Design a binder for this molecule. Sequence first.
Ligand SMILES: NC(=O)C1=CN([C@@H]2O[C@H](COP(=O)(O)OP(=O)(O)OC[C@H]3O[C@@H](n4cnc5c(N)ncnc54)[C@H](OP(=O)(O)O)[C@@H]3O)[C@@H](O)[C@H]2O)C=CC1
Ligand code: SF4
Ligand code: SF4
Lengths: 363, 216, 62, 383, 135, 199, 90, 150, 119
Amino acid sequence: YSSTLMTADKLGPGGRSSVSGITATVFGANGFLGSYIVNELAKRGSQVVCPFRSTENEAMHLKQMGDLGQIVLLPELDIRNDDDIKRAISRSNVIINCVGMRLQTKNWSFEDVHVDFPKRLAKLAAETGQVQRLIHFSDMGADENHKSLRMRTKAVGDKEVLDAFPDATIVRPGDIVGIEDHFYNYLIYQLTLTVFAPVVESGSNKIQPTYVLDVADAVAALLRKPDTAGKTLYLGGPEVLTMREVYDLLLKTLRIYRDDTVHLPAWAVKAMYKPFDSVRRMLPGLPMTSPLATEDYVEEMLRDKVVPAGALGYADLGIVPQKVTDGLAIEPVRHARVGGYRWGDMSAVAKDIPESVRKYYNI
Amino acid sequence: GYAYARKTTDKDYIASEHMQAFGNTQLTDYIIKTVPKFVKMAVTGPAQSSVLYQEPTIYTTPESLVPLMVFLRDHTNTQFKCLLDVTAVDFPERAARFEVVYHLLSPRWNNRIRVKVCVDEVTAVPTLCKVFNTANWFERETWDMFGVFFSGHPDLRRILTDYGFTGHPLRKDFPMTGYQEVRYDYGKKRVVSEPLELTQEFRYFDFNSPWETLNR
Amino acid sequence: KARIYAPARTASQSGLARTVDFATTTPAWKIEFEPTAKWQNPLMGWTSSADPLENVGRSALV
Amino acid sequence: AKVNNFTLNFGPQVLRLVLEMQGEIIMRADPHIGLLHRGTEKLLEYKTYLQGLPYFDRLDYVSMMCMEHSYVLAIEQLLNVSVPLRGQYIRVLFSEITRVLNHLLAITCHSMDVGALTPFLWAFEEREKLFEFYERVSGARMHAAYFRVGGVSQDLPIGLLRDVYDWARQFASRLDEMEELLTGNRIWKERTVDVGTITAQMAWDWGCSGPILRASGIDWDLRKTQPYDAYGKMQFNVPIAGHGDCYDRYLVRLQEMRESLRIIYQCLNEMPDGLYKSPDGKVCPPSRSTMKQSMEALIHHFKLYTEGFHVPAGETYRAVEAPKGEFGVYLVSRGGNRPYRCKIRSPGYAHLQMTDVISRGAMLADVVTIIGTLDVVFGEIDR
Amino acid sequence: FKAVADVEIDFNNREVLKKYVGIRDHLSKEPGTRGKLIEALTEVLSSIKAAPEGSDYRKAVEASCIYRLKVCKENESDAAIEEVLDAHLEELIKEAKEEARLVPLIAGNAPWDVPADYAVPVVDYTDAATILDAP
Amino acid sequence: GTERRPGESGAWKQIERQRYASDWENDPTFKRTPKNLAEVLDDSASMLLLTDVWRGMAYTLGAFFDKKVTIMYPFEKGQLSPRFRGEHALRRYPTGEERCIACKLCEAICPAQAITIEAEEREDGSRRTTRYDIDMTKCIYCGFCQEACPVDAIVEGPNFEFSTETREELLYDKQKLLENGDKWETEIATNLRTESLYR
Amino acid sequence: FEHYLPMGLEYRKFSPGTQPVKAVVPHDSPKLVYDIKYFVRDYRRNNKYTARTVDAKTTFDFDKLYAGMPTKPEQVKNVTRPLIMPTRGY
Amino acid sequence: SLSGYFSRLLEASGKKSVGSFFASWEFGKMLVDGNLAHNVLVRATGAGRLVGTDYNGNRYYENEEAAYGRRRWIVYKDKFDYNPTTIPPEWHGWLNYINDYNPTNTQFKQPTYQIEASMTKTGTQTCYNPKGSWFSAKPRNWRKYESWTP
Amino acid sequence: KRLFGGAARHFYFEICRCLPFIQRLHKMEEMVSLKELRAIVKEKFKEYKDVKDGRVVDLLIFKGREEIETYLLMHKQRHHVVTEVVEPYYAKQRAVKKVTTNSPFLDSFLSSGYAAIGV
Ligand SMILES: NC(=O)C1=CN([C@@H]2O[C@H](COP(=O)(O)OP(=O)(O)OC[C@H]3O[C@@H](n4cnc5c(N)ncnc54)[C@H](OP(=O)(O)O)[C@@H]3O)[C@@H](O)[C@H]2O)C=CC1
Ligand code: SF4
Ligand code: SF4
C-alpha cells in the first residue's frame, strides 16, 4: 500500500513495453489535463482505463498512448449510473478524477458534477477494497465562502471526498497553460476577435499559473510518495502575477500595438454578463461560449488565487516547476502573432556558414 | 559507347569463337602478364555471365585501383565500360576486415569481371567517380552501410539510413534491430527516439548439424 | 563484459564438426554477453527484453 | 547578372527532391532517398535460403517473379543444380507475363502523370487478368513465392494454358486501342519528344540497362546475349530506336510488350510433360504423398524445412533482364545454411542517379516526365 | 533488330542505318573510313614506344595493332572490316584513340616494374561434371 | 503515327537546332516537306482542324457506349482458386481430435517469426500444444507453414474478409484458430481434395 | 478487333476446384524409382578449387593468339546461342 | 412482361404485395442505399434463375449468359446491415468462383464440431480478445513460476 | 606543435562560427546561450583527447562534420538537441554532489537488478 504500489509488480526498465504494475482509471480522460495524465501513466507501462461520454472521434487520440491491451476505452459513460463507475474501476488500484465543469447547463449543474459524483465515486472506490489511491482534482481558488458557485461546489465536494475516502489526495492547481488550455486560449480570443476586452477593476488580483506537464509529473510523484495520501496540495508556478501583467505579457508576445482592453467596475461587467446567465439553463449548451462570460469569473477576479502559506506544493514533491511566461510554455501563443512566427533576415549569422547551406536557404 | 545495333537480321550467335575463347580461358593470364604490379591474387570461378563458363576475379591494392580500372576500361582487349555496382563484405576475423568488390560488364565482348580491394576500417579507398559516373552513389551507400571512407569523393554523405543515424548497419557486430526506436509522444508533441524495447524478443534458432562437412 | 570461448560438443549427438577439433577448417570461437532483464507481455505472454546485444554475439561473430 | 539559384523542395508526399532553378530552367536536381529503406540486406543474413526468398517479391513489387529469378539462379549456380525442362519453360512463361504486367503499369502511370487518365483505367483490367493468372498457380495475386531452387513450387493447374491463350488472343487489340489515344497525339509528343535525352556513351557510363539502353541505339538484351533457362530457344526481336527520347522509350516499351506476347504464345505451344522440380532430394523438398509414406522423404522434409540445405562456400553474381533493366544478386557463401552476404543490384538505383544530368535545361513540368520515364520503384531502390 | 518507327526504312543503305541508331548525332558526325582507322592504329603504334621493349604490355598492344592493320590491309571495303572486327568503324577508331590515350598513364604507373622473383597465386575452379559425367 | 516534325519537339536545344539547320531532313523518322499543293493542304488539315484529337475522341465515345467491367461488391464477388492463401486456421480429424502434434516445424520455417508455440504431454499421454499463437500483423501470408506441416493441421483458408477495429483482435491464440477451422472445415476439405493431386 | 470481356463459358468455363479431368502429376523420374544411389549424381559436393602453380614465369605468346583470328569476312566463326540450360535428362 | 418484373420483385424482396413492398422500411433504405437498390431492383429482377437458399435466408442466383465473373450474385436477407460474413462456407466457394459446388448439387460432409456462420462482432465489446486482456472474465498473468506465499 | 596539424581546434573554430546560426534557426535563444553551447561542444571534443592515431582523428572530424550539416539542414529539430546534446551534459553536471548521501551503487541497487542501457 505504502510504496508497494510502485515497486511490487514493476517489470522492465520503464518504457512502452515494460510493466509498472499500475492499473488506473482516469475519469475525464479525453479532457485537457486528463489526456496528459493518461499519457504520463501509459508511457511507463501502466494499464489505463478511460471511460468517456463524448463521441469516439474525440477520444481516439488516447488509443495511441500505450502498448497493445493497455489502453482500455469504455464509451457511453453516464456518471449518474453507478454500474458504469463500478465497471470502470473493477480492476484498478488507482483512481484519478479530472471531471469538472465551467458553465452550467439545463442537463448538468455544478452540484451534480462537483459534489454528487465525487461523493458516489469515493464511496464506490472504498467499497472495492483494492483501490489504494484516489486523486481528486479541484481548483486553487476553491473555498466554501466563495461567491463564485463553482469554487464553492468544488470545496464542498473536496470535503465529501475526504470524508468518504479518508486517504484520497486532493490536488488544487492554479491556472494551467498548454496548447489546448482554457486560460491563454480564451485570453487570446478576448484580445483579438472582439471589439473590446473587459478587465474587472484595476486587474490587480494575483494568480499563480502553472504548466500542464508539471501537473502530469506531479501526479506520478504523488503516486510514488506514500506520505501524500490524505493530504491537499497546491500546484503553482514559480512566479506570482497580476491579471494586468498577464494581459501585458500577452500583448507583448502577440506583437499587438493597440491595447484594446478597458478597465471596468465589477457591477458593469456583471451587468454585461447577466443576460447570458439567466438563459444558461433551458439550453443544451452552445459552442464558442467563453467561460469568462459569467458572474462567477467576475467574483473570481475580485480575489487572489495563490498558494497559501505553509501549504504543500511542488517542492515537497521534488519538482522545480517550469516558468510560464517564457520558454516552451509561451511558444504556442508566439504562433498567433501578426504575420506569423518566422525567423528573420537570418543574414548576420549566415556569414561563416558553409557553402550549400546558404544556397539551400536561398540566403 | 558500344554494342550499337548493326545487324538488321536476327542473330543466332553470341560472340565470336576466338574472342570468346580468349575471354573465357586466357583473360586471367593476360591481365597478370600485361600489368603484373596491379594484380596480387586471382581467382577463376563460376562465371557471372552464365552457368556454363568461367570468369576471373582480380585482387588489387588500393594504391593501384584507379590505374587498373582505367586499363580495364580502355584497353582494346578488355573493354569493361559498365560498372554495375560497388559493395563491401565484412570479415571480422581478418586483420583487414573489409573487401570492397567491383563488378564490371563488357558490352563489346559479352564478358564480366570482378575486382576486389582489402582494407580495414581506417584505410581510405580511392574513388572511381572520375572513371565511372555511377561510382558516386554506390560509394555513398558503402560508406553508409560499412563505414568505408572513399577519398577524393565530391560529397561523401549518407544516402540510405536515417538523418541522425550514427553507426554502420551492415557490419557483423551491429545488431539486427539496432539500439534506438521511434514513437510519437503526446506531451512533447514530437516524434521521439527512445532506447529499444521489444514486446517479443527475436528468437534465434541454431539449426546447424554437428555432422555437417561444408562449414568453412 | 564479453566471454571468448569455444563451445563444447552437445551431449545429445556424437559428431564433432562444431568443435575446436576442426578449428582450422571452421570458425568455432564465439563472443558472448551476460543476460539482461526479461519479463512477460501482459496481453499475450511473449518474452520481452530491452537488450540490444541479445543475439548479436551468438549469431554473427565467429 | 550575379543570379543566385532559386531552390525548391519537391514532395514529402516516397521521393524527396531538392531542385535549383535559374528562372524556369532547372540547373540541379538532388534526390534524397531512404524513406523506404527497411534494411532487407541485413535481415537476409538471419534467414535460411528458403526463408529469405519472399524478401525478393517485395523489392520490385510491380515485377515479382523476375526479382525471385536472380536469387534462385545465384543459389542454383553455387549448388550445381540443374532445372528440368518443364520448369524452365514455366519460368520463361511467367517471367514474360511479369514483364507485360510491369510495362502496362509503367506506361499508364507515366501517361497519367502527364495528364491522360483513361489508359490507366483501360490497362488495369488486363492487369487484373494477369493477377488472376498469378493467383491460380500460387494462391497470391502479387507475392507469389513461386520460383524455387531447382524449379517451381507447384505444377500448373489443368486449364491454365487454355485461359492464357484466350487472354493472348485479344491482348494485341488492347495494346492497339491503347495507342490510339497516345501515339499520334500532339500533346503527348510535345510532352515527350526530345525530353531527357540519353546517348550511348552516357548510358554505359551511367550503368543503364533495359528499355533506356535500347532507345539509344544499343542492341543489348540479356535474354539474347547471356541467356538463362529456355530463353535461347525463344524467337523474338529486340526493338531499337535512336534518339534517346521519352517518346522513343515509350515506343520501345510498347514493342517489348508485343515481343513478350510472342514469347508467351511460343511457350503455350511448346510446354512439355515431365518434372517441374529438380529430383535432387537434398535440395528440393519431396512431395506430400512421398513424405507420408517413406522414411527418407520424411527425414529430408524435416531437415529441409528447419535447417535447410547447405550451400558450398564460394561467391557468384547472377543477373536477369528484369523489366526495368538488369537486376542482380551478389551472393557470398561461407558454407552455412544462411547467406553470409547478399548484395542486391537494382537498375532503378542507377537510373535515378542520372536525374541531375537529365533534368538540366528542362522545366518544372518535365521533372515528373523524367521520373516517369526512368521507371523507378523505391522498394528496389531503397533496400 | 526491330525498328520502332512505323515508317518503312531501307537499312541496306549503311548511312541510313548509322543515322537511325544515333551514331551520327551522338558519337561521330564525320563518317569513319578505312584510312582514318589506319592513321589511328599507326598513332597507337607510335604512342606505345614510351613503354619498354621487354614489357608484355607493349607486346600485347603491338600485336593487337598489327592484327588490326592486317585486317585493314587485306580488306578494301569498310563493310568487310565491319563484318570482321564486329563493330562500326566509328567505334573502332574510338577504340584506337582510347588505346593511344591509355599509354602515358600506364607508363607513368609502370606496372612492369616488379622484382625478378615476383609471384602471383591463382586459384582455379573445376566443375563436378568433369569427374561425374562421361569422359 | 510516330513521325516527327520541326516544331513539335518538347525541348529547346532541338527547337533551336531545327529552325537554324536542316540536319532533321537526313533523319528518316521525320516527316518530309510537302512538295505540291495537295500535300500542303493535307499538312494544314493535320495541324489546323486537329483530326488527331478526333480519333482519340471517337475511341473514347465508342467506349462510352460499350460494356463495363465493374462488379457490385458485396453482392458480387471476384474469382479465386483453391490455392488461395487467406486467414490461417487449425484443423481436426473427423473424430474431433486435433491434427496438430506440436512438432514446431511451422514455427521454424516462418520467416516473419509470427508463430509462438509451447507444449507438454496431455493427461492421456498424447503430444499436444498448450499455446499456439499467430500474430496476424506480423504474418506475411506466404503459406510456408502450410507446406511445412506434415499432418495438414495448419492451413490458410479461403477467407479474406477479416478486417477489425482493434489490433488486439488480430493476435490469434489457439482457441480462435480452432474456431476458424470448425467454421471453415467443409470448404477447406473441398479445396484439399483437388490440391492433393498436385502437392 | 478482338473484344474485351468475353461472355458466359467463353473464358474460365470450369472453376479450378471443379477441374473436369483428374490430374496425375509426376514427382519422380522412372529412372530413379528403383535405382536410388546418390553418390553418382552428387554434383553439389564434387566441385573442386585448385591452387594453380604460381603464375610468374609463364610464356604468353601473343603470336598464337592473333594467329587463330580471321582476316576475311568469310572464315569468321561465331559461337551459337545455347538453346536451353542443362537439364541432365529430366 | 411487367407482371414478370413484379413477380420477380416480390420473390426477391420477400414481401407479399407491391403495397407491402413500397410501404416498407426496406424500400426506404433502398431510396438512400443505391447498392442495395441496384441489387434488388435491377439484378434480381433480370434474366437469371434462383439456385438456392442458405440457413441465414440469403438467396443465390445465377445467369450463364452474363459476362464471366458476373454470372453469380447473392440477395442478402438482412436488408439493413448486409455483410458477406453471413455466407456459409458451403456457399462461399460457389459465390467466389472457387468451385462449382453448392448444396443444391453436392452433399458436403458435415463435421460434428461445425460452427455455423454468423455476422462479425468487430466494433462491439463481444469481439474476440486474447486471454491477457482486460475484457476477459479473468485476466492471465503469464508468469512461468510459482511465488512463495507464507 | 599541436598534434595532428591542430585539426581539432580548426574544427572547433568552424563549429563555433556555425553556432549562432544554429541558435537562430532552431529558435534556442531563450533555452541556451552561445557560451554554454560552446562549452558543451568543447566537452564533446575532450572525450577523444587521448586518440593516438591521426586517421581516427580524421574519421571523427568527418563524422562530426556530417552531424553538423544534419543539424544545419533542419534534419534534426530542437527537441533532438534537447534530448541528445544539452540535457546529457546537464545531467552529468547536475547529479554531482547530490543532496543524498547514497552511493551510486545503492541507487543502482534500488533502481533495478541490472544496469541501465542507453539514455
Ligand atoms: N486550468 C484548468 O483548466 C484547471 C482545471 N482544474 C480542474 O481540473 C480538471 C481539468 O479539467 P480540464 O481538462 O482542465 O477541462 P475539461 O473541461 O477539458 O475537462 C472536462 C472533462 O470532464 C468531462 N466531463 C465534464 N462534465 C461531465 C459529465 N457531466 N459527465 C461526464 N464527463 C464529464 C469532459 O468530457 P466531454 O469532453 O465529453 O465533456 C472532459 O473529459 C477539472 O476538474 C478542472 O476544474 C483545476 C484548476 C485549473
Ligand atoms: S503463412 Fe507465412 S507468415 Fe503466416 S504463419 Fe505461415 S509461415 Fe508464418
Ligand atoms: S500445426 Fe503442423 S507444423 Fe505446426 S506444430 Fe502443429 S503439427 Fe507441427
